Point group: C3
Chain length 346, copies 3
């Protein structure tokens, strides 16, 4: 009732309340915005899921969210966007993945310094990218996160004396894939792990929690999150990816995100638009593969660049099919509410 | 007369006729669009040239063209662009080059699955790139092809168990070049081989057939294709490229395309604009070496990125000289008819 | 008196007199535009600093400037920009760094051929980039130079039989940094060396001279040049860079340029923009590291790519703070005159 979707009522209720609680609320919506959700309860559930995988990653994610939100305020960015959590989600990722990609492991306190630095960067990236992309009425997605992360990880690299990153190298031989060995149960677990990997978690229970957090806000978003993850697995098997990479959900997170995006969030949901989302989800998985190989040559991970590039690409697609409709950015909420706008005008 | 230029007489006639015949027309015009030509007789001639070199590559080219054109229809893309062949050329290249860059050799039938998949992305890449580039009134050129190709070849790579690509590695030592062995005859043959390479064909006869196919539509385009190829050869020599790379036309195809593009087609042909096409063709050959080196590090070929980036760069150049005029995209056809618009505007 | 700032009085006097002096004026203003200065006395002084470092680089710089200026005239480019020197500074850099990155050493006379050819591409690169960037009211900065150089050095490479470039390879082990060895004297020298490295000069005297040339035109530009160089040093230390790299001013030149740009030149100088300039300079230094690692994998230097991208990113940041004001391109002079324009309309 009051804890579904955008929580419009709880938003209007807080407006008159203390600054501290209002701040905590924006942070939690910042966390949920990683999956296009603006819901503080979803934020709590996600944070819980993060504490379940790795309490270290949760801390860095939270520090990241706090610093960026505070930086957006220092730099007088738009209040609507802040309250909606749009100034926190990129730095939520910056903090988690910097911890994930650190060769120094859990509770390396020194990590907090470059996390804050890089989190402060996110409002700057967001603003700049917005100046360009809003001219086509495109969102920034997690481009701020991916630029910050690629920048940070290549500046340090595996051989930095203070902050070595994990070593990543290109493929240099044909992997042996034993097809009889392929487990049905393991593919099924890959689905929630693909979703877990959105926040860089490889735990199946965590991904289930994220699925639930999403479901609280929008069942349609939850559905596409799942399907996107599945399609990533399918693409993985089609190029003969090592099973262990599929099981770890590394083929599923970009696809999961792209599918949510196209499947009713940034395009109004119709059957044609649902087919479009599957296509985009597949395409993203294959671009994930491409970017992973190419970037490994420079010791970088692909991050969510593949999601950003493919999704932006599909949103710049135009058609003379009236059933394929791009939402105005200023009207973008969740699929259920988005669809009502489509039925009234198209 | 009827079989020259844009063939707009035959197109008007075909409009009333059966669906399947119209479709063959669009497919054939898609094939000729690789060299900016919208002519089904040129499409046929080019296809013959292809079937001559390697029927396997020819087949993949056609499957791409078909699948793309069908995807364009399925996704309600502009009709006129489809009928002009603008929705088939990128995938013609996707199919041919996916064959060239496969480590599996001829008639590896499975290759048809990814060729089809990648050919479906071509209308998507086209529309997305148009949404950006049309704001500066620029065409997308072969950017859809080059994106699709770089994506596919890097997602697979030389070490894919299913679809290995051919191994491509950077240069690791100074090539020994024996200058007395340089051959005028071989250099001269490198001219049509460079035009052949536009469709990934290293045969001088095939390249001759392509020049013939172009000439039928537009003598001026044919001339710039030849000139562009020549300038690429000059660029390779200027950089002491290994003779065999020059001989295989690898320095010629980007140059050739750039020279056609600037030399009458996207710029109105004047003596100034001709010099510009010469400059662009040189520049493009140089960028080709740059991109080939850099891309070899990640195991990719340069494709026709060089032509795409260089030509877009020269089209974005603004000048206060009235004799250097950029064609409005909606009024772009071939240099002979383009020049009439320029004189009458 | 008449030898500071634009020298708008002196240029108005030249508007009448012989073409060869007018041309020489443009070449000299072209040389100074490297550090955002349009002043021919500044140009002569910079030229002296180049001749002090290495006459061979100085020559190639000059061939660069002249050839590029001749080309912009041939291609009927805007004359206002030519007389201001905006058509010479990219090729000044092209000529100089082509000599620096040549593996053939001093007075390899054949080098003058591709220097001339790459200089001819500079106005082409400037115009096209202007076509795109002027839509957001942005300058091209040194993007023509950086495109020209990246293309040239990668088209040739270390293994080219005519024009081999110097060999650049990525980092492959953790360097050993002994902190007790850090030197105050060497660090102090790093500051002017950073400014010298804007023209690829590693001589502290040359960097001294360049500071003097800037000071002559705009003392506020001089201040930010020095601060930016210092912030790059601080960034280097913060990531435990090899001391010798910091001593060569390798961490200083990009951040120096960024600091001049934001700190009065393309943003009106206020307290707020001064701070923003310090942030942009730190940011630029870290991107320098990033771009250097990545571009070394393909055997290329970063050039001033980091400065170009960082500064453009900062010029695209919008805020609801009226103390942070972006200069209209048509209005940009030096910081002192810029601030006056701003205060009038504030
Ligand atoms: C349109 C007009 C406006 C222009 C505005 C300019 C915007 C400036 C953007 C500056 C962002 C640079 C930081 C991002 C990544 C870098 O760390 C490096 C660059 O090699 N990335 C890497 O090493 C790898 C990243 C590669 C990802 C592929 C990107 C498609
Ligand atoms: C302003 C709004 C527009 C936003 C639209 C976003 C468009 C994104 C395109 C996404 C598709 C990319 C596919 C092409 C190449 C990739 O596979 C990778 C990239 O790392 N290949 C490579 O590394 C090789 C590619 C190198 C070619 C040079 C690039 C100029
Ligand atoms: C908005 C629509 C208008 C589109 C207009 C197209 C503009 C065409 C510009 C293309 C010229 C670029 C050539 C420069 C350098 C290259 O040779 C090499 C290889 O890619 N650089 C490198 O390997 C290093 C490059 C690293 C720098 C990162 C670039 C962001
Ligand atoms: C504000 C400037 C921050 C830079 C200081 C970072 C200090 C790095 O910390 C160092 O890292 C070593 C290995 O990486 C560890 O063994 C030690 O904990 C520490 O000496
Ligand atoms: C979603 C589509 C996935 C297709 C995966 C094909 C699985 C069978 O793969 C087959 O396995 C054999 C040995 O087990 C190999 O010798 C064959 O090369 C291979 O095609
Ligand atoms: C859409 C999914 C396509 C899967 C097709 C996989 C094709 C596998 O191809 C296999 O390659 C082997 C080489 O290692 C050969 O020895 C086998 O004979 C061949 O069947
Ligand atoms: C296209 C302009 C470049 C001219 C370079 C030509 C150098 C080739 O050299 C020529 O090759 C001939 C082979 O046909 C030989 O007969 C000649 O002996 C030889 O001089
Ligand atoms: C535009 C006109 C195209 C010119 C085509 C010239 C083809 C010459 O081609 C040559 O043919 C010889 C046998 O005939 C072979 O021995 C050579 O290897 C081959 O290069
Ligand atoms: C369009 C410009 C073409 C370039 C022609 C270069 C001619 C190469 O000339 C060769 O250079 C070598 C030194 O590099 C010498 O050792 C050889 O004796 C000489 O013949
Ligand atoms: C535009 C074409 C320019 C051609 C430049 C030719 C450069 C000749 O390069 C020469 O090669 C010799 C043999 O390795 C070297 O010993 C010499 O140092 C070098 O000057
Ligand atoms: C821009 C036009 C200038 C072209 C001058 C090129 C002439 C080549 O100059 C040669 O360079 C060699 C390498 O340093 C020297 O060994 C020779 O002394 C010199 O003749
Ligand atoms: C801006 C960054 C702070 C600079 C750190 C200062 C470290 C200098 O260290 C000093 O170096 C001198 C050599 O010149 C030695 O004589 C001194 O003994 C030593 O303490
Ligand atoms: C301006 C920021 C200065 C950065 C902190 C410099 C102090 C370096 O601290 C050093 O950490 C090293 C771990 O790699 C140890 O080997 C050294 O013994 C220790 O002194
Ligand atoms: O807060 C959790 C604690 O976990 C331990 O493993 C770390 O060593 C402590 O530094 C940390 O405070
Ligand atoms: O984890 C790295 C280091 O972080 C520092 O902030 C703490 O003082 C140390 O206890 C710890 O070893
Ligand atoms: O009333 C809804 C109307 O909206 C328009 O924007 C559509 O193009 C019409 O075809 C439609 O009937
Ligand atoms: O056209 C398809 C067939 O071509 C023939 O020339 C070959 O013998 C076969 O291996 C191939 O499958
Ligand atoms: O070249 C591999 C091919 O082998 C044939 O026997 C199969 O029928 C094809 O589907 C397969 O792609
Ligand atoms: O200044 C011109 C002269 O300078 C000398 O130092 C070089 O060695 C010569 O190659 C050159 O002719
Ligand atoms: O590289 C570090 C070296 O610095 C010198 O100043 C010391 O005397 C050596 O003992 C030390 O090994
Ligand atoms: O007038 C400029 C001054 O403004 C104040 O707000 C700052 O605190 C000072 O540090 C600064 O020097």
């Amino acid at each position: 009732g009051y804890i579904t979707g955008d929580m419009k009522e709880f938003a209007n209720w807080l407006k008159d309340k203390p600054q501290a609680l209002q701040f905590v609320d924006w942070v939690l919506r910042g966390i949920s915005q990683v999956v296009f959700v603006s819901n503080p309860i979803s934020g709590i559930l996600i944070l819980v899921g993060l504490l379940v995988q790795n309490p270290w990653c949760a801390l860095n994610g939270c520090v990241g969210t706090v610093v960026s939100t505070l930086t957006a305020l220092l730099l007088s960015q738009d209040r609507s966007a802040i309250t909606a959590g749009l100034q926190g989600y990129n730095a939520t990722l910056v903090g988690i993945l910097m911890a994930i990609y650190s060769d120094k492991g859990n509770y390396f306190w020194w990590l907090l310094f470059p996390v804050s630095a890089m989190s402060m960067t996110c409002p700057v990236f967001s603003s700049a990218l917005n100046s360009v992309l809003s001219k086509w009425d495109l969102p920034v997605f997690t481009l701020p996160f991916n630029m910050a992360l690629s920048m940070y990880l290549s500046a340090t690299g595996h051989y930095n004396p203070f902050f070595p990153s994990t070593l990543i190298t290109p493929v240099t031989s044909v992997p042996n894939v034993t097809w009889p060995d392929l487990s049905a149960l393991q593919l099924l677990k890959s689905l929630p792990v693909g979703v877990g990997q959105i926040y860089g978690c490889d735990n199946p229970w965590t991904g289930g929690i994220f699925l639930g957090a999403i479901l609280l806000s929008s069942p349609l978003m939850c559905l596409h999150a799942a399907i996107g993850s599945l399609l990533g697995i399918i693409a993985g098997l089609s190029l003969s990816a090592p099973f262990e990479d599929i099981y770890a959900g590394l083929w599923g997170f970009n696809s999961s995100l792209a599918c949510i995006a196209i499947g009713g969030t940034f395009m109004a949901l119709t059957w044609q638009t649902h087919l479009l989302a599957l296509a985009c989800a597949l395409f993203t998985a294959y671009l994930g593969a491409s970017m992973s190989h190419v970037m490994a040559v420079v010791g970088l991970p692909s991050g969510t660049w593949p999601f950003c590039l493919a999704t932006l690409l599909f949103l710049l697609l135009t058609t003379k099919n009236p059933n394929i409709y791009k939402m105005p950015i200023s009207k973008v909420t969740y699929p259920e509410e988005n669809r009502i706008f489509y039925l009234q005008s198209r």
